[PDB]
Write an enzyme that holds these catalytic residues in place. Structure first.
Site, PDB file in Angstrom:
ATOM      1  N   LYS A  90     -25.335   2.154  19.574  1.00 36.07           N
ATOM      2  CA  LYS A  90     -25.218   3.605  19.553  1.00 36.07           C
ATOM      3  C   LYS A  90     -23.765   3.953  19.778  1.00 36.07           C
ATOM      4  O   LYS A  90     -23.242   3.824  20.868  1.00 36.07           O
ATOM      5  CB  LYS A  90     -26.163   4.270  20.583  1.00 36.07           C
TER       6      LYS A  90
ATOM      7  N   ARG B 281     -22.807  17.647  13.818  1.00 36.27           N
ATOM      8  CA  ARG B 281     -24.259  17.754  14.027  1.00 36.27           C
ATOM      9  C   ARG B 281     -24.644  19.170  14.519  1.00 36.27           C
ATOM     10  O   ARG B 281     -25.666  19.719  14.129  1.00 36.27           O
ATOM     11  CB  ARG B 281     -24.693  16.693  15.059  1.00 36.27           C
TER      12      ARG B 281
ATOM     13  N   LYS C 258     -35.582   1.107  16.313  1.00 36.71           N
ATOM     14  CA  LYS C 258     -36.391   1.839  15.344  1.00 36.71           C
ATOM     15  C   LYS C 258     -37.426   0.908  14.792  1.00 36.71           C
ATOM     16  O   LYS C 258     -37.122  -0.247  14.498  1.00 36.71           O
ATOM     17  CB  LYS C 258     -35.525   2.348  14.168  1.00 36.71           C
TER      18      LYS C 258
ATOM     19  N   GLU D 249     -21.584   8.412  12.564  1.00 36.89           N
ATOM     20  CA  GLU D 249     -20.877   8.693  13.816  1.00 36.89           C
ATOM     21  C   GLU D 249     -19.417   8.516  13.545  1.00 36.89           C
ATOM     22  O   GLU D 249     -19.009   7.423  13.180  1.00 36.89           O
ATOM     23  CB  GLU D 249     -21.323   7.734  14.913  1.00 36.89           C
TER      24      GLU D 249
ATOM     25  N   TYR E 244       0.828  -1.211   0.000  1.00 34.68           N
ATOM     26  CA  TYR E 244       0.000   0.000   0.000  1.00 34.68           C
ATOM     27  C   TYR E 244       0.862   1.262   0.000  1.00 34.68           C
ATOM     28  O   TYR E 244       0.615   2.177  -0.800  1.00 34.68           O
ATOM     29  CB  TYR E 244      -0.983   0.062   1.194  1.00 34.68           C
TER      30      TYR E 244
END
Lengths: 308, 308
Positions: free
Chosen positions: B111, B132, B282, B166, B34
């Site tokens: 979370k 945010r 959710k 996040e 790399y």
């Protein structure tokens, strides 16, 4: 904040209007409309800079970044043409071709009295513009060339090519510029070429932007990705790819046609909106060009007739 | 000078290796390979700057341009979630959903204890990243976010969308960073979240680049161009579009499933390479989310369980 619809609209309209004004020379809307839409996009990009793009119409106004003027080698060295000064010269040229490869079609084109430039495209984007220099190495004036509307910022196919052109200032824009210089008791430019030189070889692209420049593209370094089988077909293809070419080119069948073309442009050059210093004549067929090859200096398949 | 073949090869390889390292977490070549290819591309871009592009692997190194930290409104304000602290809280949430719309599928996710960010894509290119902030207005840290390999510089389809994620620093990289601080007269970071905040609030994107950051993407502002019918399907679709999502998500049939997911992650959270401060639950189905709507503060269709 999601302004994608309006930004893409403004891009489409300003791109269409610029092409109509500066390439077709056939406007559809008045200046007031172009200027209004341009000021709107500018305001959008100021307040929402995430919408700025390498090929935005706002590139044409010039900006912050300055031309490096760095020495850069062309991907492919630019040709140096032999000259012709009379009918005798052109007949010798013709005979040497006819004795080696037979009877050929010629393409004739006006020799723009401009500044020769190489314009490199990578993935179809305009990424580097160099002066011809010594033919091998030029000066990077990319940021300045970007302000010339007749140079596309993105071509119609994502090619990796170096196109060659003549950058110039239209005769009348030169005269009007000189009128402003005199109004401000500045030294007047000698001629359109000197004015276009001055305009390109300075540091502020916003000043280049205010000058009235255009280009005619006449060739490319590499025909690999072109369907063209001839120089004339190559110029038509450049047209389709989005470039600005000279519409006064002509295919002729023999040297009598070449002489006729020169006689025509001797009388008609006066009426052109740009200066020319000659007529370039090329064996049209690309394969036949390859057959003729080069001397140590010059193609055997091309000659530059020079007006006195 | 026509280096198009090698440049595209280098982009292809480096983009592949970056994804394998930083997204799949399954390398195919060692760092030496790399680094060698990256150093090659950097040298090419230094000597042939016409090859630089907005989405070059070299972007990851950081550059001279600084994050503005300007106040910028999100295209779509970010949600603020109600909290749950125990089984009773989650049962009340569940009951109010099932009294109004019936028995629903839930998606559960970890979370991430990170910095919430909005990442705006225009024509599929990453063009703006904001913290945010207050949910309506955040700070422009685009230049710093660009150095996080887990954020794609170009998505697989040319959408105009704001994804939400996040941003975080892996636990082990936080610990190693703190060990380095304890070499100079340097104060240690309190926790990974604080380290990542410090790393993203730098003026120098090259410093951010040297920090080990990553992201998990959890939602989008607008599902218009998504075929997804549910949150879980939307996360799968973001995966296929080239984003980094959290694989520990689960669809569950009911509140008993939710509770079991939380009990699992109470024990397993310690083994994770990043900190979590809860579990978000959710209503999975997007139409059903629309059905439940919002209070004046928060979606009625989602809740954040918080670990004590």
């Amino acid at each position: 904040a999601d302004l994608s619809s309006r930004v893409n609209e403004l891009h489409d309209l300003l791109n269409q209007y610029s092409y109509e004004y500066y390439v077709e020379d056939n406007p559809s809307v008045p200046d007031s409309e172009y200027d209004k839409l341009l000021h709107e996009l500018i305001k959008i990009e100021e307040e929402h800079p995430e919408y700025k793009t390498v090929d935005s119409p706002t590139v044409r106004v010039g900006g912050e970044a300055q031309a490096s003027f760095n020495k850069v080698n062309h991907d492919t060295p630019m040709l140096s043409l032999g000259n012709a000064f009379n009918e005798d010269d052109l007949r010798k040229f013709d005979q040497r071709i006819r004795e080696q490869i037979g009877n050929v079609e010629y393409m004739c084109e006006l020799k723009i009295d401009g500044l020769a430039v190489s314009l490199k495209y990578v993935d179809g984007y305009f990424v580097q513009g160099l002066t011809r220099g010594d033919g091998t190495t030029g000066e990077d004036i990319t940021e300045n060339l970007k302000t010339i509307h007749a140079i596309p910022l993105k071509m119609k196919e994502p090619l990796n090519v170096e196109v060659r052109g003549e950058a110039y200032m239209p005769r009348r824009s030169f005269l009007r510029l000189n009128e402003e210089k005199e109004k401000n008791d500045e030294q007047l430019f000698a001629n359109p070429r000197n004015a276009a030189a001055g305009s390109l070889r300075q540091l502020d692209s916003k000043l280049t932007a205010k000058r009235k420049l255009s280009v005619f593209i006449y060739s490319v370094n590499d025909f690999t990705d072109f369907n063209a089988r001839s120089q004339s077909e190559a110029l038509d293809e450049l047209d389709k790819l989005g470039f600005t070419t000279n519409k006064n080119r002509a295919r002729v069948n023999n040297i009598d046609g070449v002489l006729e073309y020169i006689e025509k442009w001797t009388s008609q050059r006066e009426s052109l909106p740009y200066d020319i210093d000659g007529i370039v004549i090329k064996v049209n067929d690309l394969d036949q060009q390859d057959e003729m090859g080069f001397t140590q200096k010059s193609p055997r398949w091309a000659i530059a007739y020079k007006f006195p």
